[PDB]
Amino acid sequence: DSWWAKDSPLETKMAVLALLAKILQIDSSVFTTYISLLADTKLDLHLKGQAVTLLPFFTSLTGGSLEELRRVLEQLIVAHFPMQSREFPPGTPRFNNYVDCMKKFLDALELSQSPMLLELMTRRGSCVTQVGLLESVYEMFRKDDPRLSFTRQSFVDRTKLNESTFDTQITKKMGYYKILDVMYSRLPKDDVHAKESKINQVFHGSCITEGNELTKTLIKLCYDAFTENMAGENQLLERRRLYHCAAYNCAISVICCVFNELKFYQGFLFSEKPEKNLLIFENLIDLKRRYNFPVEVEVPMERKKKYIEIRKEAREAANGDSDGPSYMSSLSYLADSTLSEEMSQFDFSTGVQSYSYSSQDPRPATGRFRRREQRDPTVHDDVLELEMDELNRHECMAPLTALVKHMHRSLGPPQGEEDSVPRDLPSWMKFLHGKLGNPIVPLNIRLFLAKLVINTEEVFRPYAKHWLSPLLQLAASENNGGEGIHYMVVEIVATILSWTGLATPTGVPKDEVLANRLLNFLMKHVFHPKRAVFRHNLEIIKTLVECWKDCLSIPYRLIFEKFSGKDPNSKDNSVGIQLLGIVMANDLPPYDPQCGIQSSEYFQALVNNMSFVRYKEVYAAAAEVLGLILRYVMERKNILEESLCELVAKQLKQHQNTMEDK
Amino acid sequence: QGLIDENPGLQLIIRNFWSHETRLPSNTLDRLLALNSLYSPKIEVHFLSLATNFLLEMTSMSPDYPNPMXXXXXXXXXXXXXXXXXXXXXXXXXXXXXXXXXXXXXXXXXXXXXXXXXXXXXXXXXXXXXXXXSYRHGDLPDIQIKHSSLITPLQAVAQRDP
Amino acid sequence: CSLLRLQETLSAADRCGAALAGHQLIRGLGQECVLSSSPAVLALQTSLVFSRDFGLLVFVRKSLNSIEFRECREEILKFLCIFLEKMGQKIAPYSVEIKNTCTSVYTKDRAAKCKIPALDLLIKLLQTFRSSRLMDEFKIGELFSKFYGELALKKKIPDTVLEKVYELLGLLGEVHPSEMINNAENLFRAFLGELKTQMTSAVREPKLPVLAGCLKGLSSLLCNFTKSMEEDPQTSREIFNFVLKAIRPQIDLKRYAVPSAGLRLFALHASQFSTCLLDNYVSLFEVLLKWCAHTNVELKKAALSALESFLKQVSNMVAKNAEMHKNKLQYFMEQFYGIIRNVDSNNKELSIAIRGYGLFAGPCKVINAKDVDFMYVELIQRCKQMFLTQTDTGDDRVYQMPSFLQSVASVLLYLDTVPEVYTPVLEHLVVMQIDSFPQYSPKMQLVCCRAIVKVFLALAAKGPVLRNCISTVVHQGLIRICSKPVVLSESEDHRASGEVRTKDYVDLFRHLLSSDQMMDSILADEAFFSVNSSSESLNHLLYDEFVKSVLKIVEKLDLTLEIQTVGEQENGDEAPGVWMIPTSDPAANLHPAKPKDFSAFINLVEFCREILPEKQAEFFEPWVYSFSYELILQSTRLPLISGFYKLLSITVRNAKKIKYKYSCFALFVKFGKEVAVKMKQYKDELLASCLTFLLSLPHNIIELDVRAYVPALQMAFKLGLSYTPLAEVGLNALEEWSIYIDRHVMQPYYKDILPCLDGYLKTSALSDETISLEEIRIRVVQMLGSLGGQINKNLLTVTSSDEMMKSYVAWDREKRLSFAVPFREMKPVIFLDVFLPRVTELALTASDRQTKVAACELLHSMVMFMLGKATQMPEGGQGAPPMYQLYKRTFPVLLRLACDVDQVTRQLYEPLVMQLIHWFTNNKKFESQDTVALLEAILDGIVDPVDSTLRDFCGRCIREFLKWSIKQITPQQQEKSPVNTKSLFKRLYSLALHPNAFKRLGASLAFNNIYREFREEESLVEQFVFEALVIYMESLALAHADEKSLGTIQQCCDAIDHLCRIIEKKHVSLNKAKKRRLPRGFPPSASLCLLDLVKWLLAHCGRPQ
């Protein structure tokens, strides 16, 4: 506090004098460049240290209220670029005479610094920083910061090349933007809203950290009302406003809790909720963009918490928020499909996050009834990929998770059932009838998240319907993909083994068809990906085959059809047989793979495969085959096996002759 | 030559107890005679340790349990240990460390239950492995006859080992 | 497996037939064998297979025909050449066999003309021959070199082959066979002329097949030929023009690759002919170069390898010419300078190195002609961009920044200004490289090693203050980044824990060590600054927080442990040695490192008979000084250095001259006191081990200063016997101790000195009977044999005085200390023989899996029995006095050393003894004798070396006065039974002053402190003793006062007076009179150390009255 005030009050009085000499020298000035370079970079350095020992006292006002400084901040801002990145962390004063100056002598810097290049990129706090750190490492600090690059290396270490240099220009340039003025928040917004770029991560961290750290019930509302009115009425494109919504929410959903003014003005933004303008494309974009934005931030404003501290319902906020998703009966046209349905979903899916905190049984259900959409499906039903991929652009899984959460958190405390329809009709559950549509797949993923903790005999017939739809539909997602088959079919199998008592009311009544065709299918395919990818494929279906075997519809006719492969120069015998061993595992070796149901000597054709090949599949198939045929034939009628004993005998002979050893 | 294994406790146990249950006479004193008929053959040290485990066991198996005043049963479970899971490496060093824990758990199990109840002290050294990632009235009856037959083997065994 | 079977089917079946039965075979014996990955398993399978395979095909088609055999042999040779590169080496005799087979196979192909299998075959055979560069044989090289030269000097074969000729001819020419290398090299002229004069007129356009070979040849043989002047520029240069077209055909880029590679490995006279083309072909040469550099080729690095090389020629002739030969140079490199600026527009990427390396080559020399801060100042600014921006996640491989830094080094090989601004920048660039040194490959690791020695060389030549601050901060970064510790054996882990407890620390030292002893010379002043700078910095390093950290957390984390009940035990423990935790894990993390390497740094660097007097005289003083706050490893760096200094003669001779520059030796003497005391008093057995390495060694060095004084080595060796063999650490340091001093003026004193000596010696021989362990013992044996004179009458009085035949067996075995009644027959239970054995079981620590558990659990149980059959009127009853005491002593000490290994086990053993110390208070005397008497000798254990047994003990007492105060049974029992209260304090005060005051003092104080919370509250009994509290100080104060032999005692005693503060709550009012009289009577009897206490009492008691 002594030598600190020493070094500064003089540093203002000389900061007046023999500094600006060098500066204007440089800006005006082969000898000329060396003089410019030494003089400036020196004075830069000095200003660095000088503002650093400015900040541990009555600065800020001592910063921005005395004299001869801003100019110096800005001049070397208007000569070069590289030996300028380090004199750039410092600054950020407030009040007039300055605000203008910064935005001016600044935007122009980003110009000579910030292109729209393609994606590449790679009191409180201060008292935490002084009173928290120790001495042993501190002395690394004090000997690191005075001049030299341990100044700024210490607080960093612990297309390609130049896009990287630009990249660090953003590093300093938004890095220090984490902890300061408001316009300093504003430009970042602009920049995030061009396209996408491994700037992403740095922006997320930056913005998140802004909301957490600032906290000041003043600065807080400033950044909020601020980027809001940066979404105020003004001529900007489309991305800039959606990206304005994404990096605004991520400005808010991880922020200080005193919502005050944003939530206040929320009176006005509710008042802008309603409109119309058809069309001239323009207010089309601005409608399905403005109109779909505020609802978006609004709804996880009601994310969590101070909701029950608002005790409200805005009485009428339900009205439009529930109206519009249910609606747009209108046919497509006007390019109002995938650029308005996409954010027409947010109204509903996210508005629910204003139902859960107003949810106490029937009215919630009716927020989840009755149908009419198919908001975001059909749109993306002609697109999308996997579960997560089904999730984001759709942004319907991503809500219906927490939805099923608070909905089971409100399904269990009243009671619990073990009957299927008496839970369907009362609660949302009534939607679990499947349908003929394209939005079956999403609804199916929502079930992928119910079954985790929902079940059991409840959603019953749908499981089997979801065995019926994957034919056309599963084939319709191209084929599925590896993880595609697994998630869809593997889960329906998953839930189905997940029970005993109730797959018997689908094992005595319903299995007869649904199962039969399903297993038929499952086998026929499962050989394919395995004779393409890896072994476990068969098993990934086989085992469930076994879980199912306790009934079925005897589809072994085709199981030996598939065995009865071609001849050598194709390892398809295997493809056919491993199934057959799978078969043999159980059930009177499944009626003895129908060996006398379709034809009469298919069995004989099995023998007829092994003898031809020593192959690692035909032997073991034959092995266990003769096994349970022999154990059953020592405990069942012998005439059945005897012919086989004769056939294998024939084989053994042929193998001794045809080749000695192997 | 097999009555002492090179290492595997399970061969040795199953062999020893094939020597012990029927071949060794049901009489106390007659077993005392069968002893030196069987000792000299090893021509190999620590026999008498084997002596003790055969005899202390035989004379202690069930006059001693309920008339007091574990290493053979954890022995048979340590013969079903090597017949299943776990082979070599420091995993077997957690099985020898858990063998330390249980070999202490024989006559300690009483005293530690005395401290509190049946499940206390059980993990012992493995409790640190788990941690990283009726008290007075309880002490009083163990010191009486609560399970002093559990004191018999830890005697014998602690003597057998060195 | 199936490979042996199949090959034994269709090879011998191939002996009588062929066709399909070959190819299938060869695909079979191929594919399975192919997938062979790891060695051992896959290797051992594949060895037999490949062997029978090589030979089999050899004599197979060798003894067959054509028809289709040729096709099978063809295929096998293909699959084999792809089997060799994979199956590393290990196929040498097999290899030479395969190669002569390959030429035999082309030979059989000589009879038949035209066709295509000749080409498949021929090429494949060739590639088998090519991938043979293991060599190192003898005739294996000439056997093929001669005959390929033979078949090449004559054959008019077309083209579909000629690559092989020059391929081989270079391949063998790169080995060595002398007169072959000659005859070949001369004979090449022919081929060169054929193909080059061919490429001028016979064919309008270049031909790839024979260029392939030709350029391979002239590339491969000329490194051995040398003196190239004429043929290279034409040939090479042309090939560059020829790839400066390209269309679609593959291998096009490799045509370009073979020559430029040629030129780089010819950088001598050839590159001179290119020097001449720095004007007409100044654009041409580097335009074929750089234009290649941009092409997306597998030989991008052809661009550098030619570039970097011909830049070696630039700086070369550029410097070995005159001034006339300068400007035409500056032209080229200023085009590079433009590659430095315009990369702002277009990222040269790989070429950004070029220009750095560019502003390297000529800037090593053309700099000299003209001022050039332009270059280098720009480069400099650039390297500060590329490193400070490493605040980007660009994995700008830290092998890149010493390409840049290498270049920065010769860029920096010149300086002459000093304009501030360069100071900070160059400085950080140094530190970055000095920090980029762990992360490398080992190869590039040596590259950057070489970098740092260079760039430092320049800085040393230049500015005379900076380099120092370099070494300090750069050492700081290393030693702080140390975290975590790379030392996670027992004893060493123990010292490092006794310090502090919880990119390798180790790695960096290779760089530092290897830097100071790399290229010799100039390493001088360099390495000196390096040393002392590293020091003074560390000196203040631990001096930061560590110093505080010990005495801090030892009273901090102990406070978080501290509660109303535990604070007493903690006071007890403050007497053995501290809590060992540390507060300030920063200084406490890096400084361990600092010593810890600092051995591995200082041991191998500047150690010459000129550095090693200044080393001692200087380095001694401030170190030991800085230890005067007490810390093992801190001491561990002192003797390592002190005895490693090869001055056992100047230091010894000097010291003798002082007894019959000296000030350092006055310190030499000075440390001995505080030193030995530190061992005995505070040093916990593991940390005791630590300090003792370090107190062994200094003496070991000052031999003549180890004149008399046996208390050192006795504790030394005596630990260094059966305790430290577990790692030859403590043991080792001792042989040399005796040997060196065994004839270092220790001759006058022997009969009195060497009984102590054999006295220890016995537990390194005579235990180790009960740097390999046995070898330690052997060195013992040698060590003793050399003597002969008095190895005997020593270990006599030794073994006898130690007795070791202490046979307790309780009242000489009357009957059975603890019968039993189980079998109800031949009970044998007795146990009198079953005690001193269990004693040795708590001492065992050997088979802690079997021994500790059932041995201890057993002893416990046996304890239970003896506890019980002690109630009737048999021998047991009045039998408790021998029985019970004699085991009882070893019961708490069981709970303590059980602490180390028993854990949950020791846990229950503790309260077990504690219930056993409450019992005979809540019952009767006779058994009171026991615990109170032995433990009454446990705070005699503390004044022994014994340590934690004392804390355990205090924890016993504190509960036994609790069991008296609980055992009311009418205060009629209070007076009638005489075990506690009055009887206590008698035993206690008398305990305070028995032995004058020495190894008994640290007992009384512990007691009072351990009981204090109870002395606080219990009625008028709080009265009389408070007066006797005044004798206590009077006791203990004077007690240690006169015989103040360092603290440990001096402190806990004062703490007992900080229990005398409790009285001061105005009571009974005779205190105001008598109790106030005493402090008055204390000035005239001020007893040397009561001073601070006396006066205190005066003001304090006149205070409230």
From Swiss-Prot, chain C:
Spans of repeat HEAT: 279-314, 929-965
Record PTM N6-acetyllysine, positions in chain: K108
Top-level taxon of origin: Eukaryota
Record note on what altering R1061H does: In a colorectal adenocarcinoma sample; somatic mutation
Phosphoserine: residues bearing it: S497, S818, S990
PTM comment text: Autophosphorylated at two clusters, the T2609 cluster and the S2056 cluster. Autophosphorylation induces a conformational change that leads to remodeling of the DNA-PK complex, requisite for efficient end processing and DNA repair.
Similarity comment text for this entry: Belongs to the PI3/PI4-kinase family.
Self-association and partners: DNA-PK is a heterotrimer of PRKDC and the Ku dimer (composed of XRCC6/Ku70 and XRCC5/Ku86). Formation of this complex may be promoted by interaction with ILF3. Component of the core long-range non-homologous end joining (NHEJ) complex (also named DNA-PK complex) composed of PRKDC, LIG4, XRCC4, XRCC6/Ku70, XRCC5/Ku86 and NHEJ1/XLF. Additional component of the NHEJ complex includes PAXX. Following autophosphorylation, PRKDC dissociates from DNA. Interacts with DNA-PKcs-interacting protein (KIP) with the region upstream the kinase domain.
Protein name stated in the entry: DNA-dependent protein kinase catalytic subunit
Record organism: Homo sapiens (Human)
First-to-last residue of the parent protein present: 10 to 1180 of 4128
